[PDB]
Design a protein around this ligand. Structure first.
Ligand SMILES: O=C(O)CCCC[C@H]1[C@H]2NC(=O)N[C@H]2C[S@@]1=O
Ligand SMILES: O=C(O)CCCC[C@H]1[C@H]2NC(=O)N[C@H]2C[S@@]1=O
Ligand SMILES: O=C(O)CCCC[C@@H]1SC[C@@H]2NC(=O)N[C@@H]21
Ligand SMILES: O=C(O)CCCC[C@@H]1SC[C@@H]2NC(=O)N[C@@H]21
Lengths: 122, 120, 122, 122
């Protein structure tokens, strides 16, 4: 909720800096430790601003297009996942990284993986 | 943009989007299926300087399935590419994550693929 | 059993899937890809629901190819997970995961994801 | 032939018992700790029987159809991933669980997740 805003780090050492707005907006920057990336990229996404009463995770997702002032990878990643708060707060995601490709190469356009974000660098 | 406009997928969902000069996607999504009614806000990003060698334009966007009427406690992200020209298409794969208790997290996420066209 | 599975199938990429469905759930056959790091036929094995529902629902199944044969070794494996539907427009509708062997540093980009639809003609 | 051969457990406590044959076969049983499943199910799959020698993992995949003598969930899972040997040996996977569905429900036929296996008995 409010618990989402701030800096998060994944298992690769990437840095996810986000603000969760009152009704569901996510805005911030992403800096990847790997791949065809340097410095920060804009991200935007959405989260459930009124998660379930049973303490289920807070669903959210966000997108990075891998273009910034320094570099353009011609690709975009979406992370889809859920935030869980508490002493071991986490954002558990799966992601789809699509590169722009010709139609013939479209079958190999999309990588899939999973990132776990924590409040401390692993 | 190119990307800007009203799109429909194979399910009959409606994707109304505007592509900004800064790489932003903004608009609304209305799903023909699932735990959804009416329009939901979406935001996303696209490559605003794509390759000129015939490649598609990479993009993605998110919907959290809460609006003024309903809350599914879930979010879909679509990742894909825009292919322009006479019969422009957006081809995607998506991940739908539901918020879940710890016991149910293994089954939190559905995966699929949606193809969008501007044909009503 | 689901006798409708056994035979030759073709996907939208021009690949050929030749399979035998055993009475109690075995899939065995060969796969020839029209794309990627692949030449000639590769062994496949998998499983299917040999007593599917009779309400018109599909028959769940999946199979694996490791991309090594007598000609070539791509150091990768693909699994297709999907469902068979019979009738006049019989199809096997799948999603797949193609994992390459990688070093630990490159494991984040080990897996491609996509979808293939197999039909009895094309 | 085999590092891969053995009894493995994932983060859910599920048990994967596998034999890796000299030419690329995987056979064994799977018991899920979760879902519409009880006791053991047959699996088959394939792995790269001549992996790279540069420190890369060994690609593999396998399928379970969730029908056995006790229960039938009309579903199948495939795991695609790689085996990383040494200490601590691990098989890192992503999986697709497809249920047989009507055409109207096919959009929600397939779950996706990731399982990591080790030889450590919970
Ligand atoms: O190589 C590219 O096309 C851009 C960089 C992609 C970095 C990926 C990698 N970094 C990260 O923090 N999680 C994974 C998923 S993100 O697509
Ligand atoms: O490049 C490789 O590593 C081996 C060949 C992969 C071919 C892929 C491609 N061919 C096909 O019929 N469907 C898709 C998914 S399979 O992983
Ligand atoms: O059921 C839910 O949790 C919310 C609605 C989900 C609808 C999904 S999003 C992916 C797919 N494409 C669509 O247009 N609708 C379904
Ligand atoms: O519920 C079903 O349809 C059958 C059981 C599915 C269990 C899944 S397979 C992927 C994940 N890993 C496991 O060890 N169990 C769950």
């Amino acid at each position: 909720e409010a618990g989402i805003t701030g800096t998060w780090y994944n298992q690769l050492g990437s840095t996810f800096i986000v603000t969760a707005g009152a009704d569901g907006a996510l805005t911030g920057t992403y800096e990847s430790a790997v791949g065809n990336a340097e410095s920060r990229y804009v991200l935007t996404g959405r989260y459930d601003s009124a998660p379930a009463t049973d303490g289920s995770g807070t669903a959210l997702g966000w997108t990075v297009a891998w273009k910034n002032n320094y570099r353009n990878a011609h690709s975009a990643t979406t992370w889809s996942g859920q935030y869980v708060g508490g002493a071991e707060a986490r954002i558990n995601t799966q992601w789809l990284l699509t590169s722009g490709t010709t139609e013939a190469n479209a079958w190999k356009s999309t990588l899939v993986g999973h990132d776990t974000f924590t409040k401390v660098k692993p």
